[PDB]
Design a protein around this nucleic acid. Structure first.
Length: 147
RNA sequence: GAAGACGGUCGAACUUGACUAUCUAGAGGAAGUAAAAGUCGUAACAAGGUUUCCGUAGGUGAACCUGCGGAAGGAUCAUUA
C-alpha cells in the first residue's frame, strides 16, 4: 500500500504522496508501548527531523514519547493501535502546513531560536506568516531548531 | 355680501445626515456543568516517600518544577557554663 500525504483531499492526482506508517504494540498492561517502525523514512519523505512528527502525537494524545540513538526506536507510550492514530494521521499537515487560501501543503519553516519566533512560508500561492501561539508544538521547535 | 389672493401664527406629515434603546441572525474561536466500565501519569491526604500553604516572576504533554520574601493552619509550647 501507499497513500496521499493528507486524506482531507480525495483526488487521485494530488501533488503529495508517501509510504504507509506502521507501528508495533509491545509489552503488557500498566507498561505498554507503541513503537513507530517507518518513522525515519516518513520524516525523510516529509522533509522534517523525526522528533517533530513523533512529538506531535504525544501533544494531541496526552502521552509520553521516547527517542534513542542506541537502538533507533521512536516510541509513543501506551497502546495506540488502528484508529487511535489512523483517524488523525493527517494532523501533522492538517494543523500546521495547509495554506488557508488553498489546500496545497508545499510549505517550509525557518526558526529564530534567539528571538522566540517560527517563520512559515507556502510555495503554492505565496502565503507567509508564523505558527500559532495557542498550538502545542511551538515550545518544542524553538528548543530543537532544524538541520 | 360669496369665491379668491399677499402677510402672520399654531402645526400634522414628508426628505436628508447623525445619535441612541430593545429584540434577533451568524463563518470561525474559546470556556463551563451533567454522565462514570475511555487514555498517559501519580500532584494532595500518615515526615504521602523533596513537610504543606501565601505573594511575585520565569519554565514545561499534563498533573506541576525552580528562584526571592512570609505563615504554622508543623513533624518542635522544652535543651541545660
Amino acid at each position: 500500500m501507499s497513500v496521499n500525504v493528507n486524506r482531507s483531499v480525495s483526488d487521485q492526482f494530488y501533488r503529495y504522496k508517501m509510504p504507509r506508517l506502521i507501528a508495533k504494540v509491545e509489552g503488557k498492561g500498566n507498561g505498554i508501548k507503541t513503537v513507530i517502525v517507518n518513522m525515519v523514512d516518513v520524516a525523510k519523505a516529509l522533509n522534517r527531523p523525526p522528533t517533530y512528527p513523533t512529538k506531535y502525537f504525544g501533544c494531541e494524545l496526552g502521552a509520553q514519547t521516547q527517542f534513542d540513538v542506541k537502538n533507533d526506536r521512536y516510541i509513543v507510550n501506551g497502546s495506540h493501535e488502528a484508529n487511535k492514530l489512523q483517524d488523525m494521521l493527517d494532523g501533522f499537515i492538517k494543523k500546521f502546513v495547509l495554506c488557508p487560501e488553498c489546500e496545497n501543503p508545499e510549505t517550509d519553516l525557518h526558526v529564530n531560536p534567539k528571538k522566540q519566533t517560527i517563520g512559515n512560508s507556502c510555495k503554492a500561492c505565496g502565503y507567509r506568516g508564523m505558527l500559532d501561539t495557542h498550538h502545542k508544538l511551538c515550545t518544542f521547535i524553538l528548543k530543537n531548531p532544524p538541520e
